[PDB]
UniProtKB/Swiss-Prot annotation:
The lineage of its organism: Eukaryota, Metazoa, Chordata, Craniata, Vertebrata. Composed of an N-terminal stalk, a dynein-like core comprised of two catalytically active and four inactive ATPase domains, and a C-terminal E3 module. The ATPase regions do not generate movement but rather act like an intricate molecular 'switch'. The gene is Rnf213. Disruption phenotype: No visible phenotype. Males and female are fertile and produce normal-sized litters. Mice do not spontaneously develop Moyamoya disease, a chronic occlusive cerebrovascular disease. Mice are however more susceptible to Rift Valley fever virus infection. Mice show elevated expression of MMP9. It is found in: Cytoplasm, Cytosol; Lipid droplet. It comes from the Eukaryota. This is E3 ubiquitin-protein ligase RNF213. It comes from Mus musculus.
Length: 33
């Protein structure tokens, strides 16, 4: 269950990372998203 919680934490850090990718608004940024 601890590995699942670590996977969830890595998932939400990855989601925050791709939200930081979409922080500047451009076509290349959304294509990379």
């Amino acid at each position: 269950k601890e590995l699942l919680k670590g996977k969830k934490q890595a998932a939400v850090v990855m989601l925050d990372r791709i939200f930081s990718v979409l922080q500047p608004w451009s076509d290349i940024n959304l294509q990379s998203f």
